[PDB]
Symmetry: D2
Subunit: 518 residues, 4 copies
């Protein structure tokens, strides 16, 4: 009658679908992490507190724009909002900070010297592209400067050039030395500093530009939790970011953004090298035909679920909400289906960065994800995850799968996991329990980074280390108990699964207990 | 390396997903019917010609607005466009006409009082709101919610006392929705009665009947359509809680279903619409009755030449869910890019159809398939099993009424179902079913029936060769019957293409 | 090894295709072997070899023998079993089972002799009498039997079967105190042979005066279980339960299903019983012989589904009464009982009176071990978990997690500390591949555990240590030492360990994955 | 009826749970019964009863008996069989199978004693406690120190300790005799594919027009190829069934199967060569691989052994028969039970009764799902038509699948998908009719009606003959739905048409 449990018990997926029930309400816990891009509509301490209350788990900073001073202040503000709740550790919600790199972008110049000016473009008309910096702030209906120095070499005649999220389409007629002449194949308003794509072209910008170097250094100085690396093409790109981050940034997670055809093709090597993946559908759906994006998304989510590495679904998930308080039916569907596909996290960009309804957008992602989570066909999912798993003598892995089996058997209210590094909780998440995973840690970075994983609710235990280690273990379990009760995941006398190890330190998780809530 | 054949052979759905390949191009055939709403953007004969070339299969006329004269001219223009291709039956594509009814409506005329007092009819303001639904008090209790102007405003409860739960600009003659209520307005309005007669007179192929709440609303629509309209398909629009809850009885009485998501997401929480969509698609798939996914599928294309990433995903996921048809409303009625919208649904649908996990899907449709002594059903399942076993280029079905080809479609073959018919209405109505590619044979009835049967099979061979579904020497499946007339399909053959 | 290539197959057909005669099984054998004890196997000396050969349960057939005789058999089984108690690592618990006579029909003596036989010829006449003057004067013309009411339950046309159904008779005339019959299947007729009336509704009591005395004797002798013969319905089981009473309340009642009504009323019988015997001997006389595999598979499935022990019995290695090795059908029967899901398999004449009792035990051991490895655990465990219920019981949740974990790491064993056996029973019901080493201090728990597939019971003799954590470890390390000594695993393998959070029954909640020291 | 409650279960466990002794099977029994003919069964009058009791194939064991003797058996088989010929509606074809002697090795022993094996022909007539002569000249090349040697159907076990001779130690002792059979477990025995006697016997089989050969001691594909060569052009249509009898045969099973027309699981000899506890693994592997390949497989040896002396079988025997069928065996077999026993007719009837019960208890839902999943997409029309027919047969629970066939092949292709419905294979070819018995579910009927002058009418006459057969034998009745398979032109290789038709 609740949590789509009648659908959960179907012997076929068709029957599962037939039993999906709009009158079967979900549980409290939402498992899929929500990443919100911060910008002018959401960077105030005031709004950020409401973002957090509304379900934001990760704050994304887009380094395609803005100065270090600006990003430093956003980061300061996220931390002020986040620590405003720290006085009761039981109700404190950790919040991660993500740096999203500019990476190898092509950008246009300023329309008539203004960052906000635009010119309407009639379809069929003519337009000159120039690399002459003379016109870098004098773009208009007739001449359009962009910043890719090498553009003329990697494009031939008849090549297609796309501007502003692929919405403006241009065809190369004649090649010059510092220029291109083009006809507006598809028209609309042209604005300032818009993204440009050359889908037919072997673009040769570096993996990690000088600007990216400076930004990644700022990321280390600012103690960011993860980097979302733009336009990753191959494993060596990932290795370059990892080496750039170097020793000071060794614990920073690298999520590779797959946004072009080469990244999809070389996906397996990229995943191996990365800490996680973002399906960056914006650019991806300009670089490859828009009608193939769902194939790429489902392939990458599947391969990440198979590897146990976090995957993020991104871009235009609730786009209409930039201007409207409720989303379109396609948007509702997109969010639900990302969760049903297996995505660990879902993302907001303009919806939270600049839109008129940032909070409504976060709340809608929260609502849809929780409904979709209840609609998952765990019976087949869990069977297939168990089947496809390399079978190993690893005792931590055996403990994790037993816990998840145990949690299904008793419909547990949670799987409580003590973890220093997060790994033990990550191992549970990989097997996709219905039960929320309460990951208890003293490590603040573990607690923030754990939001990358479906089902993990990180809680940051601030209690002092007790002299007797068994009493210290029991202290943290009890903390987890108090957190679940306060958030309404479970109540006195419900059963929960508890995972602990046999000695202190990382790598010893080997003990699964089935315990009633006190 | 074509048609996601690699992913097709996976032992698990997870491995199927992992094998999906953006570099594995689909075959030419696109199976999912595309329904386009016609309006100022798309109504001229020349544009309609291009709409058909772009992939429109069904022209939807929204009777919520427009005169009979207007709609009659729209239908005439659809038919001029469609018949401009009639000279070559091998390439001719039938186009269906669908009449989507206005249906029963509630219309208007902090703290706010709702009054039914018709002296307050033209005296609407911030203290007094008049409504035209006299039974509203029977249907709503204390605490019930009331939405105004397609959801824009929110309220809580021969008079009603209400606090305004979500404010806005309140206008004249606005739509009202009563979430969770058993609305007892008649199954059909006065206008609807007249529009349905017009539909019959104009020889429309199907009716999309609005705001269907129970089996008896369907029976009423059926009764209005009457004997002259007995062959017109009734597709029930499920738009509110009651229709979802009483889905099984509606489905049994209907020819098929529309998941009317626009109205559904005003009536039920927006975050639950996907549940209702997936339930209805699965139940229609289990019954073998056509289901249409509707509303905002490519909505940004009203203004823009490319869709959003969520819209791309929505179309694909509707197809993967099992929807027989996908629909366009404003995108084709009013938008700046109608042709591009139709083309994008075609491209996505075709990719999605190749990505289907047929191995589990057919296995489950088998398992849930009732054992009956019906010969046509046994022949259909055999033909679909045979088509997977030999990777046939098509399944060719001779059909008078469509039913034989519908029975094949419900088992969801990968191979296109070429439904050869001499009945023009059957050829139009067949677009409602996933996988059916209808062809209208215009050749005279040969004196020897055996030869007239072979003439039609050979017609289907010429269509597939011309359209690039298969070539000489490929194997196709062919369904025929033991005598003339409907109901006798019992013969499945594996035949080389000549 | 262990048919692990076959185990990994994604279909049953492919699993079959991968079964490999060159993939040796593990040392552990999970299916209990029940051996009927008689003159071939009763001496302490021979009982010691029975135990070493793999016997887990000694069955005593109360269809024959006096209480004085059966008390001596029990004493001998206990003396043989305790001869191994000096080394607790190699001690094997052995259960004692009492199989009731029940409502049997028996013929009299051929010409005053226990061994004499006469030949009955097809078509000849044979008169059945109830007159006790002929009780010891049966011959080819006159056959006495002890069912006084037989004339009221048969008609003309009725068939009457004698001697494991090998001799058959058709009633030509009903008299008042007799029946005139015609021989259909002839053969050698001996003394005191079992009789079946498949058509008839036999009205002998489910629990006779003699059965009552025998069940009271079972209680007094501390038997582990009772196999109740000819159970027809739930109330029959309740009559046995009533006789065992409060004092016999921990004795397991295994209902023997050996007639048509027992099969028909199976579900109510199982609900009332602690387990089932597929008593195939009488069963294949009471119903058509070609239907017995149907009843066997039905009963084994229903028992596996209910989580109740089920025993496959009768003629499994029959030829081995006379020969040192079995027929191919017999080889197949034993393997297929195990593949069906039988917790235990049984030997009757093979061990009671045959010439090769030790060989018959060894052979059941060898075949069962091979069959166990060949089980398709992938589908079995998936179905057991689906068909089980989602429940608020924390011990069930831990049991199913311990089994799942055992598959993931291909554990050497699941080690379970248990007082009453229930926690190890809960693991067994999920059919892990890993042997379940059940460590108990309770002697009866230890013996009765043999009724569950996969459980290797070990009886801990060490006194309770004051420090409970240390007492837990003591028993876990004892299990480790048994596993190494029996070759189940070696140092550095991984095993699953199940304990509770405190001492006493009913707290099993802790699963650990630990290396073998 | 027909365990149809059990047939609908969603799991195998629930399928087991619903098996019902009071759910009676249909009339049709699908599993062929192969009966060894000998003193007990060889008279024309007994052979008539054997046919009426369920015999489909008469096996002749050429390990003993003269060509004259066997010729007379064959003659009697055909006399009994043709006595039913007057009514083709009711006529049951009976096949004749020739089972070869095959290669052999021939020659009180105390446990722990030392015994020398000599190939020194000196001691041909002088074996004893200390020296034992063998006729296998290459024995030393195929055995190692530590190799086992079994003597006389496994009674005696020797182990090699030093390798023209071998010094062995007795491991399992017993009474040694003259001319006792020898087996070499795990060895690659290099004896010829066929003995000189086998070659003569195989040519006699061609003379006598036998339907199939059961070739003894098949170890490798080349063994099958040599049997095929001996049968030659005149014998090219005779089915070769390889008897798998030892470790090498089991290990080289894939190549043997590909080269053969089918397999016998030769459990008697296999349980001498390999540990008896492992024989069930060998059987289940070979039956599984035969099902996957669509080739007939026979289960043999001791299936109803106790019935040589008794009129009812043991419970283990009943179980073995039912389990061979549930394993997927196309045929089951009787040896001494029919050749020499006191109850030949009862043994045949009991295999009939068990088989039919077990066929109803099959879990077709999972079985059919897996066969399709493991069966390649190919462009072959007959295969596609065949799978379509079986699917259609399940969807309407048809009374039969009627298949016209010249060679048998179209019917064989249906049989591999394991329908519940009997497959009535209508042919004009008498050898095809007899050979069809090798395949689970095929009831071959031999049509003797004149060829009609319109080919489509001649097709229809054969379809209606099958209808009369099913009606006459109680498989179905007027108004039942049956599946019919035919082709688009005459001659083999063109079956492509599936129709669902009411029985007239």
């Amino acid at each position: 009658q609740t949590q789509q449990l009648h659908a959960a018990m179907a012997d076929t997926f068709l029957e599962h679908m037939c039993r999906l029930d709009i009158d079967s309400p979900p549980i409290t816990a939402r498992n899929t992490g929500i990443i919100c891009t911060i910008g002018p509509a959401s960077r105030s301490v005031e709004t950020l507190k409401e973002m957090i209350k509304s379900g934001m788990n990760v704050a994304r900073l887009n380094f395609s724009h803005g100065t270090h001073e600006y990003h430093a202040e956003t980061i300061k503000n996220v931390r002020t909002a986040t620590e405003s709740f720290a006085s009761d550790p039981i109700l404190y919600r950790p919040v991660a900070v993500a740096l999203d790199t500019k990476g190898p972008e092509i950008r246009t110049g300023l329309i008539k010297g203004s960052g906000t000016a635009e010119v309407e473009l009639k379809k069929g008309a003519t337009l000159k592209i120039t690399l002459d910096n003379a016109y870098m702030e004098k773009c208009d209906e007739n001449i359009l400067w962009l910043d890719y120095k090498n553009i003329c070499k990697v494009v031939e005649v008849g090549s297609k050039i796309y501007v502003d999220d692929g919405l403006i389409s241009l065809q190369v007629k004649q090649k010059g030395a510092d220029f291109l002449v083009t006809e507006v194949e598809n028209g609309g308003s042209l604005g300032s500093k818009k993204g440009v794509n050359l889908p037919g072209a072997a673009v040769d910008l570096p993996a990690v530009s000088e600007k990216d170097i400076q930004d990644l250094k700022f990321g280390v100085e600012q103690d960011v939790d993860m980097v979302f690396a733009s336009f990753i093409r191959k494993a060596s790109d990932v290795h370059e970011v990892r080496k750039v981050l170097g020793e000071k940034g060794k614990n920073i997670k690298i999520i590779s953004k797959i946004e072009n055809h080469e990244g999809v093709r070389r996906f397996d090597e990229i995943l191996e090298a990365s800490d996680g993946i973002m399906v960056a559908r914006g650019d991806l759906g300009i670089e490859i035909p828009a009608e193939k994006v769902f194939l790429a998304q489902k392939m990458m989510i599947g391969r990440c679920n198979r590897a146990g590495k976090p995957v993020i679904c991104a871009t235009q998930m609730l786009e209409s909400m930039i201007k409207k308080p409720r989303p379109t039916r396609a948007e509702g569907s997109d969010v639900a289906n990302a969760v049903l596909d297996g995505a660990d996290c879902i993302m907001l960009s303009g919806e939270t960065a600049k839109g008129d309804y940032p909070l409504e957008a976060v709340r809608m992602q929260h609502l849809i994800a929780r409904e979709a989570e209840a609609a998952i066909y765990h019976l087949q999912l869990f069977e297939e995850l168990r089947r496809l798993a390399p079978i190993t003598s690893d005792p931590t892995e055996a403990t994790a799968v037993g816990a998840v089996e145990a949690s299904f058997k008793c419909c547990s209210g949670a799987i409580i996991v003590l973890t220093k590094s997060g790994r033990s909780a990550h191992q549970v998440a990989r097997y996709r329990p219905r039960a929320p995973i309460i990951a208890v840690t003293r490590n603040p970075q573990t607690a923030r980074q754990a939001h990358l994983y479906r089902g993990i609710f990180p809680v940051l235990c601030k209690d002092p280390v007790q002299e007797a280690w068994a009493e210290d273990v029991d202290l943290r379990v009890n903390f987890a108990m108090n957190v679940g009760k306060a958030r309404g995941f479970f109540k006195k006398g419900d059963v929960v699964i508890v995972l602990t190890g046999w000695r202190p330190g990382s790598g010893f998780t080997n003990t699964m207990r089935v315990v009633p809530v006190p």
